[PDB]
């Protein structure tokens, strides 16, 4: 009925890491290519994703145990889960009132038709919105939110990983922390952990849909030239 | 003492091509990553060069005879001369009064210390400025300016070209047009053609200095990630 010292330190490290890598003011966005509303929004969103990947990488290197993995496994986990971590962390900006990502005034408020001007269709954009709504309804504590990101990144079931035994070992330790935290520090969360694991499976399908929409983008040189070097390297298949 | 019909058509095509690929208002620059004044200006200048490369490519495809070359020779000529054409066309924006490239108000006025915040040193920046001043003093007509760009691009002496015989053939035809135009349409230009050929040799040395400064940039991944896909492809050596 009480969190251990080690489980607390793991929680302290993740919350600090997330605070070190997420700006609730979104003030770096003026540094991106400005949004325009023929894939009109692609340059801005590419800069947005490239920026978030650097933040996910910063967050990952502070997950306990991650830096002990080989550089190969770190890359393997980063490449496969990068888009899933981005969809998870974007929930902090998602607003239920306007059903969009409100990162600013008119410019940085990202609604559905804006992602359309980036190679995606209204139809395939549907499960992303539903995922964000259901995730928003869980009203996760920062600890639960940050623990879910770390668990997602440390999935042993990624194409590329080698020491899946030890990545699974690290992920289960984090899953133990989340279960304990929910049980002893979240009132009325009797089914929350199960629901969070459900969102992870949803991210897998959203990940696969992005994978295919991205192969279209990266195969058209006039669109892939709009991407950034980091995006092409993280979402490329040149392992 | 009179321009031929063919020499006029070659002049008409180049002036139209340059007018189709150079904006004297520089209004697309708000679409670049904004300038900031640790290689602070690099993202803006990278977007600037990437944009100019697309314009040089557009200009090149309208040079008479260029489209008849193989795609290999076109790439070979583009990759070797891209930075030289950029330095030539930038002279239209270079102002002698402030010794800078005045493409806007405070933001898009590019002085010496701004290029320093892009991996270049004050010392190596010297021949670029002297080149621009001497080029500005020639007071070239648009025809002479646009003819010099086409002659530069069609140099048979580039690493990579194959049918150097026919690229040399195209370049000499353009050199004939420039000599004839200067002789019959430019008063007091008795030595202008010789001076323009001198500027071409100067571009070769500026090109080699950029080549080495760029290898430094492209070998540091934290800097090369700031570049664009087009820049890395044009200035890369993966032929």
């Amino acid at each position: 009925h009480m969190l251990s010292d080690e489980q607390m330190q793991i929680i302290n490290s993740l919350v600090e890491a997330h605070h070190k890598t997420y700006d609730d003011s979104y003030s770096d966005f003026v540094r991106f290519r400005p949004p325009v509303r023929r894939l009109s929004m692609l340059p801005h969103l590419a800069d947005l994703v490239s920026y978030s990947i650097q933040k996910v990488i910063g967050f990952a290197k502070m997950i306990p145990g991650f830096r002990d993995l080989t550089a190969e496994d770190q890359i393997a986990l980063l490449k496969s889960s990068a888009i899933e971590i981005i969809m998870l962390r974007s929930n902090q900006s998602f607003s239920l009132e306007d059903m969009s990502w409100s990162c600013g005034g008119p410019d940085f408020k990202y609604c559905i038709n804006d992602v359309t001007k980036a190679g995606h269709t209204l139809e395939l954009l549907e499960p992303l919105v539903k995922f964000q709504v259901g995730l928003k309804k869980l009203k996760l504590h920062e600890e639960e939110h940050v623990l879910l990101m770390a668990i997602c990144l440390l999935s042993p079931d990624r194409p590329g990983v080698q020491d899946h035994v030890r990545i699974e070992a690290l992920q289960d330790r984090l899953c133990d922390v989340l279960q304990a935290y929910i049980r002893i520090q979240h009132p009325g969360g009797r089914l929350l952990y199960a629901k969070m694991i459900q969102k992870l499976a949803d991210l897998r399908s959203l990940n696969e849909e992005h994978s295919k929409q991205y192969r279209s983008l990266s195969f058209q040189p006039e669109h892939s030239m709009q991407l950034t070097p980091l995006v092409l390297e993280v979402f490329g298949s040149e392992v | 003492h009179m321009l031929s019909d063919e020499q006029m058509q070659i002049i008409n095509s180049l002036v139209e091509a340059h007018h189709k690929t150079y904006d004297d208002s520089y209004s697309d620059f708000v679409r670049f990553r904004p300038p900031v004044r640790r290689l602070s200006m690099l993202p803006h200048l990278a977007d600037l060069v990437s944009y100019s490369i697309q314009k040089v490519i557009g200009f090149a495809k309208m040079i008479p005879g260029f489209r008849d070359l193989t795609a290999e020779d076109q790439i070979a000529l583009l990759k070797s001369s891209a930075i030289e054409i950029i330095m030539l066309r930038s002279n239209q924006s270079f102002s002698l009064e402030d010794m800078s490239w005045s493409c806007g108000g405070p933001d898009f006025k590019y002085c010496i210390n701004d290029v320093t915040k892009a991996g270049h040193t004050l010392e190596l920046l010297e021949p670029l400025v002297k080149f621009q001043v001497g080029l500005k003093k020639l007071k070239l007509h648009e025809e002479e300016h646009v003819l010099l760009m086409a002659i530069c691009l069609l140099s048979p002496d580039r690493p990579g070209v194959q049918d150097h015989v026919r690229i040399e053939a195209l370049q000499d035809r353009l050199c004939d047009v420039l000599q004839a135009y200067i002789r019959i349409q430019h008063p007091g230009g008795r030595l202008l053609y010789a001076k323009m050929i001198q500027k071409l040799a100067d571009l070769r040395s500026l090109n080699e200095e950029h080549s080495k400064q760029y290898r430094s940039l492209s070998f540091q991944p934290e800097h090369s990630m700031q570049l664009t896909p087009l820049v890395l492809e044009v200035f890369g050596s993966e032929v």
Binding site: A71, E233, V234 | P221
Partner: peptide
């Protein structure tokens, strides 16, 4: 390759 990722991972 993965030069950027190797660099960003310190």
């Amino acid at each position: 390759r993965h030069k950027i990722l190797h660099r960003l991972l310190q």
